[PDB]
Amino acid sequence: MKNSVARTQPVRKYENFTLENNLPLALGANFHDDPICRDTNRTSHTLLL
Amino acid sequence: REIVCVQAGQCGNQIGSKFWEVISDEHGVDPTGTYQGDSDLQLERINVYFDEATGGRYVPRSVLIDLEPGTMDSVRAGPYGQIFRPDNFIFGQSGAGNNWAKGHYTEGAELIDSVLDVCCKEAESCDCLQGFQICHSLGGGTGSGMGTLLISKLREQYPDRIMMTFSIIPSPKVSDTVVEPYNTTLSVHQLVENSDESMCIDNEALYDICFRTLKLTTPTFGDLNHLVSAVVSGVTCCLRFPGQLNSDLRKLAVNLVPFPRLHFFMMGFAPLTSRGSQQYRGLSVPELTQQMFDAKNMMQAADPRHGRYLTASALFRGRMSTKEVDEQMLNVQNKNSSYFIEWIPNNIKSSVCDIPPKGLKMAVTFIGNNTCIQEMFRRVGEQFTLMFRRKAFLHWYTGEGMDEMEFTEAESNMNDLVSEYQQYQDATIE
Amino acid sequence: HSAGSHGCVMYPTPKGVPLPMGRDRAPYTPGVDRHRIVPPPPEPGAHKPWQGSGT
Amino acid sequence: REAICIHIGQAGCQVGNACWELFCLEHGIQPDGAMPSDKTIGVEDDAFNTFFSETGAGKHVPRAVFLDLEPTVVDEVRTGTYRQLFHPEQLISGKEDAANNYARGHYTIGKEIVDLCLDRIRKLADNCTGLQGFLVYHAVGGGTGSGLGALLLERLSVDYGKKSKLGYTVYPSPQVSTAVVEPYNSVLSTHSLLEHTDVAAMLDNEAIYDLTRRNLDIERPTYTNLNRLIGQVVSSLTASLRFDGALNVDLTEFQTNLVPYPRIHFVLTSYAPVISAEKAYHEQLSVSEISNAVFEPASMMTKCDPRHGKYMACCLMYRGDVVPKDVNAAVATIKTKRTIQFVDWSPTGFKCGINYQPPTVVPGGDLAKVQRAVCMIANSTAIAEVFARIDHKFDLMYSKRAFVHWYVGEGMEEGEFSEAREDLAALEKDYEEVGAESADMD
Amino acid sequence: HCQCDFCNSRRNLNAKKSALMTTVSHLREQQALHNCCCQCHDSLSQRNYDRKPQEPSFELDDPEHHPNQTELNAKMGRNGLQHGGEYTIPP
Amino acid sequence: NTEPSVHPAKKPTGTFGREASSSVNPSKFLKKNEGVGTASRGVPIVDATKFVKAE
Amino acid sequence: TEGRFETIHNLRPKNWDGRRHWTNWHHLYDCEKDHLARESCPFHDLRSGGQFQ
Amino acid sequence: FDIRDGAYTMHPYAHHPRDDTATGENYTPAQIVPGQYTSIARQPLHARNAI
Amino acid sequence: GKITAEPFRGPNLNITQSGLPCLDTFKRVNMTQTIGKEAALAP
Numbered sequence A: 001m002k003n004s005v006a007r008t009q010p011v012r013k014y015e016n017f018t019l020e021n022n023l024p025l026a027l028g029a030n031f032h033d034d035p036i037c038r039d040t041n042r043t044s045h046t047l048l049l
Numbered sequence B: 001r002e003i004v005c006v007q008a009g010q011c012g013n014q015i016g017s018k019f020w021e022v023i024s025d026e027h028g029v030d031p032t033g034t035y036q037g038d039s040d041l042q043l044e045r046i047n048v049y050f051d052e053a054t055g056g057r058y059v060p061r062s063v064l065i066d067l068e069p070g071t072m073d074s075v076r077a078g079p080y081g082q083i084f085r086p087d088n089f090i091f092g093q094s095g096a097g098n099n100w101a102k103g104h105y106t107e108g109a110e111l112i113d114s115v116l117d118v119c120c121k122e123a124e125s126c127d128c129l130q131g132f133q134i135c136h137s138l139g140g141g142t143g144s145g146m147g148t149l150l151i152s153k154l155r156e157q158y159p160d161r162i163m164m165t166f167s168i169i170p171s172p173k174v175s176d177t178v179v180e181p182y183n184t185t186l187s188v189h190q191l192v193e194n195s196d197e198s199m200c201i202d203n204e205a206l207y208d209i210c211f212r213t214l215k216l217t218t219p220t221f222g223d224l225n226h227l228v229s230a231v232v233s234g235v236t237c238c239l240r241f242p243g244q245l246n247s248d249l250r251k252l253a254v255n256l257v258p259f260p261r262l263h264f265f266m267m268g269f270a271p272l273t274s275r276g277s278q279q280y281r282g283l284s285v286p287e288l289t290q291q292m293f294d295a296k297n298m299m300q301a302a303d304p305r306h307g308r309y310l311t312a313s314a315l316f317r318g319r320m321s322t323k324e325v326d327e328q329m330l331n332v333q334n335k336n337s338s339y340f341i342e343w344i345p346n347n348i349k350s351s352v353c354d355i356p357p358k359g360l361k362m363a364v365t366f367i368g369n370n371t372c373i374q375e376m377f378r379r380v381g382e383q384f385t386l387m388f389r390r391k392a393f394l395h396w397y398t399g400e401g402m403d404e405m406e407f408t409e410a411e412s413n414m415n416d417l418v419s420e421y422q423q424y425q426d427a428t429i430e
Numbered sequence C: 001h002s003a004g005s006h007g008c009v010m011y012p013t014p015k016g017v018p019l020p021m022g023r024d025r026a027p028y029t030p031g032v033d034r035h036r037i038v039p040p041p042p043e044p045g046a047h048k049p050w051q052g053s054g055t
Numbered sequence D: 001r002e003a004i005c006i007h008i009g010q011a012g013c014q015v016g017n018a019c020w021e022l023f024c025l026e027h028g029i030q031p032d033g034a035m036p037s038d039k040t041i042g043v044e045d046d047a048f049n050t051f052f053s054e055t056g057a058g059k060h061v062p063r064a065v066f067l068d069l070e071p072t073v074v075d076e077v078r079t080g081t082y083r084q085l086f087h088p089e090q091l092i093s094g095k096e097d098a099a100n101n102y103a104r105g106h107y108t109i110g111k112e113i114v115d116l117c118l119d120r121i122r123k124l125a126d127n128c129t130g131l132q133g134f135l136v137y138h139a140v141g142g143g144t145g146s147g148l149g150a151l152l153l154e155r156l157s158v159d160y161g162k163k164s165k166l167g168y169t170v171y172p173s174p175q176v177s178t179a180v181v182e183p184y185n186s187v188l189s190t191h192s193l194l195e196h197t198d199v200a201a202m203l204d205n206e207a208i209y210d211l212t213r214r215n216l217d218i219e220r221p222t223y224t225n226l227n228r229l230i231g232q233v234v235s236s237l238t239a240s241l242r243f244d245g246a247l248n249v250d251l252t253e254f255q256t257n258l259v260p261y262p263r264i265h266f267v268l269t270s271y272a273p274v275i276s277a278e279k280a281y282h283e284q285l286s287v288s289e290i291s292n293a294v295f296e297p298a299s300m301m302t303k304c305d306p307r308h309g310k311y312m313a314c315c316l317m318y319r320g321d322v323v324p325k326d327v328n329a330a331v332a333t334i335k336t337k338r339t340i341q342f343v344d345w346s347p348t349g350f351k352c353g354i355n356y357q358p359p360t361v362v363p364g365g366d367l368a369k370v371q372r373a374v375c376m377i378a379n380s381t382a383i384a385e386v387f388a389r390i391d392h393k394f395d396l397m398y399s400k401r402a403f404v405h406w407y408v409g410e411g412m413e414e415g416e417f418s419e420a421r422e423d424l425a426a427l428e429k430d431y432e433e434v435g436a437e438s439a440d441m442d
Numbered sequence E: 001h002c003q004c005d006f007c008n009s010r011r012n013l014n015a016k017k018s019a020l021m022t023t024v025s026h027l028r029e030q031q032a033l034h035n036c037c038c039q040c041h042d043s044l045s046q047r048n049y050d051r052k053p054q055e056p057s058f059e060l061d062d063p064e065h066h067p068n069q070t071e072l073n074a075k076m077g078r079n080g081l082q083h084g085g086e087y088t089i090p091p
Numbered sequence F: 001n002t003e004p005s006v007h008p009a010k011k012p013t014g015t016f017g018r019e020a021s022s023s024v025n026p027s028k029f030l031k032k033n034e035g036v037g038t039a040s041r042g043v044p045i046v047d048a049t050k051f052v053k054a055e
Numbered sequence G: 001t002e003g004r005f006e007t008i009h010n011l012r013p014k015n016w017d018g019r020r021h022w023t024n025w026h027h028l029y030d031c032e033k034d035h036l037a038r039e040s041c042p043f044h045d046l047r048s049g050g051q052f053q
Numbered sequence H: 001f002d003i004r005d006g007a008y009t010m011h012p013y014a015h016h017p018r019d020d021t022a023t024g025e026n027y028t029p030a031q032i033v034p035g036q037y038t039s040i041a042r043q044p045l046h047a048r049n050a051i
Numbered sequence I: 001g002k003i004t005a006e007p008f009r010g011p012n013l014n015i016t017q018s019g020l021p022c023l024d025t026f027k028r029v030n031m032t033q034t035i036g037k038e039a040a041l042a043p
């Protein structure tokens, strides 16, 4: 990239994860893909940063 | 016995991220890559899908290819994305344009050498190599064109191994892309020559599974990709855990394919049932068999009642008796005898594996070779002929450089496939 | 009736006990084959079903 | 004074686990291979010698090889409870399976593994001084069991010559089935078993399931039950070598008494006091009652009915509390029955054996404990009916060449199907002809 | 299926009732489609009726997937091969 | 006199790769029944090598 | 079970009592009826108990 | 009860898992199924997990 | 079947994995390694 060199890959939350909450990865329980569970929707070129 | 995975295009990369989450969970791999499992049974077959890093860590044997990095950038930002090896991501600088000819001929030949270099680097490291596994959609652009290109190159370079594909195919009711018939026809033409076994899934069937069977209030693409990852990880379960009756990808192919062109299969997974209704009925081999043959649990829009089964396979996971399996498969074959091809004395293969997925007592995945797939190909050929007679969008493909004879060849090959299925459906001993 | 129905289940009769009957007028003799057919091998010029496409 | 066991593929290794569990527990060898003995020279036995040899450190090791093309089952043996019992060289495993193809096992893959097996068998046979046969366990329905079992029996028959080879074989059941291609593999297998075996015992899982439901009280049987029954039968037949008795029977006496003509070597097997604990309270178990039991078709371990044929020879092994006079009275009563028929050229139809050691009880087992038992192996023309059901399924599939391209691509001529099918037709006609009463001058 | 008289009568009644119901349903659907009952719409209605698909059946006697082998043997005359053969022992 | 295995231990191109970009031309498209000959398709690949099969 | 032997009605599949069978096709056995009746596993559950034959 | 998109639906106040059966013990998701990581040949009988 | 004639279960009966009838409960046989590699490496 040709932007400022101080930028770093951002931090994402992805709350309501079953594997982090002592629960099995059951069918129809993928809450971490629900857009309401994210904190931002901005796409960031992580493959270059 | 090592599998190499290839993920191509948007659909392939998205399904792959969920697949590698499911596999990492089943083997107890932390998202940092450290082994944290709780039984030796998890560790003793980790090599099948994972490569070994030095201290704790394991790295997953997968190649990701796309023409614009946006999907890859979404998966890398996900919660398990870090596990993937950086050198395994291959990308260009301009998109496929949803066009098969661009993906196959112009940007395809530009990228393909770096993909073949990565695939060879991964293949030649195995002590003994099992088949390749590829996920892509047939209706797209880079998925269809580069997936079939790469399949052709790997079949030239590795003709003695197995070639397996999981493929997404257009719904009968609503299109996601206008030019779907061309891309589908050309991809099926490539697959029927090159592939050994191909599985097909309709997004409409996953929507109906989620809304009707699981009664989910707000389903998301994570659920559809979890259903697909569940069946995909189930097919390989006998490769990587002990059992009373082991099975293998080659053994599945040998029992499923009567003749080499008839290698397109339907998929289903049985213990789908809503959390509210689970209390009313317990888990048992009759219950699994009943769900297994219920069309509600099958991942295509075509229904078995319009065709006949040539062959079928059932892979059972869990601790269970062989007597119940054998007597269930006999009773189902005898009671529904008109739907089974009569010149084969027994159409179903069974296999039994000890280790179920966490939190289910038992599960089965079902693979079926059924003639009702001919209705899909017939529909695609109809829509292709409608577009081609009128040159509806043909200038894009011809401007890239394709000869129209390619289109007539692909149409003729698919039409012969439909005829061959129809003839074997209505064959008789005499 | 010394041998019995040889394990076969016969439809009951109001009088007596029925006994199985052989083909035509031949005596009953299970376990012996009357007419065995071995089909011929295919001719060398026959088309192989896996050779090509089309019907 | 010794016998060597060869276990092939999945069924043969799993049946081997039950067999060696039983033989260990019956002799008293601990799972690590140790057994205390007497400290004074000359006061010691030898019965283990038939199945075990001791090392200079006093470990016992068994006269067996385990052969498989897939690793998983042998690695299960390697990680189980008996890890220290077996010598690691004996547990031989390849890389990849024969994928239900007899052709793949025979031509392509078994050809790589067969020389290691032959080298191990040679190393065993050199450490013997009165070898009197090979015992082979395999299923003919699967690819490696059929193809490598045939190839190995051919090589053994060339190298060892006159030494006897006795097979226990799991044949494809007449309506229970596990794989589509079972008829092709079983047909191609039977030609080799025809040329290269001295006595062949036939088993069907459907019969042992019926037997475990009817006699035992098991709602949900599994392969371990069937394998324990097979182990009991083998222990009964080999007990005559290992323990004191009134009438011993050497393995050559079986062949002399049971086999009338050199091709007529396929035999039926049954075992008498298969009974649950509840039944033991209400059932007497006299010699004549268990002798009457061995003749019921509900007792057989192969799905055939002997009333549709004629017996040529019977061999009755009694172990436990039996007196020869009671055996004679029982056999004379059986001979009196009119539902039991012998070919008119075989007037003296019976061989007897009497051994003093009663059958052993296994901690997890389902059989009751009993003071006496009888086991029978018998040759009968009814077996010709068993082959016909497999041949019909072969004709059904082969009329359309349903799967043949796998076999032709993996290296086999199409001609081999027709040859094998004609050989089974001739074997059926042999069993029809040998069983025909009397003759005529014209 | 069964060959009793009751089953045959029920099957015939089902056939007649199904034919009548299909006809009346098709006419109702066409009338709803056109919002007219004139004679000019009969040809297109007949064409649509011809174009309507039907579910398949595999118990028919035309491909004849379920042969009756004992009746066939009785009709042909396979009553036993006298004097034996190259594969059958003489009786 | 035989190779160690039915799978080829001898091969011209391995990890070095081959020039595949120059092999794709729009005027040399794939035709019917012109796929790669493979043992799963019924062609005896093993007969081309020097591996000695069991007699 | 539908198609049981303990009824006058015949709910078995078409031509089940005279189906193509190893006693009929390419063979000719006098005991064809007995073996046809025996190998009907889900239909003789009372006669045989829970047995295959 | 209501029909939406050609399928039946139930309000989740009358379609939910049971609130009873609280055993008062802590378990990982790998301990839900008894005999999760044991094979048939290792242990052919079925039993509750050891305390 | 009917369970009205079945004997009661005592409070001291072990119905968990430790009470399985197997080679462990048979106290005649010794499962402690005595000779071999495992006995050599044992503490």
Ligand SMILES: Nc1nc2c(ncn2[C@@H]2O[C@H](COP(=O)(O)OP(=O)(O)OP(=O)(O)O)[C@@H](O)[C@H]2O)c(=O)[nH]1
Pocket: D008, D009, D010, D011, D012, D014, D015, D069, D070, D097, D098, D099, D100, D101, D139, D141, D142, D143, D144, D145, D146, D170, D172, D178, D205, D223, D226, D227
């Ligand atoms: N009685 C009994 N039958 C078994 C057992 N294991 C497998 N079988 C049967 O044997 C047949 C399968 O043969 P396999 O032993 O699995 O074939 P294989 O030797 O592994 O050959 P490959 O599949 O090529 O590796 C089926 O009919 C099974 O029902 C067993 O432990 N006991």
Ligand SMILES: Nc1nc2c(ncn2[C@@H]2O[C@H](COP(=O)(O)OP(=O)(O)O)[C@@H](O)[C@H]2O)c(=O)[nH]1
Pocket: B008, B009, B010, B011, B012, B014, B015, B096, B098, B137, B139, B140, B141, B142, B143, B144, B168, B170, B176, B177, B203, B221, B224, B225
């Ligand atoms: N099940 C599923 N289908 C998808 C997903 N992403 C795209 N699709 C479908 O795949 C087709 C589009 O192909 P696409 O992946 O965009 O082709 P590409 O542009 O070459 O990558 C459409 O039918 C989409 O509905 C996904 O994550 N899951």
Ligand SMILES: [Mg+2]
Pocket: B246, D009, D010, D070, D097, D142
């Ligand atoms: Mg196997």
Ligand SMILES: [Zn+2]
Pocket: E002, E003, E004, E005, E006, E007, G008, G009, G010
């Ligand atoms: Zn009726």
Ligand SMILES: [Zn+2]
Pocket: E034, E035, E036, E037, E038, E041
């Ligand atoms: Zn009008």
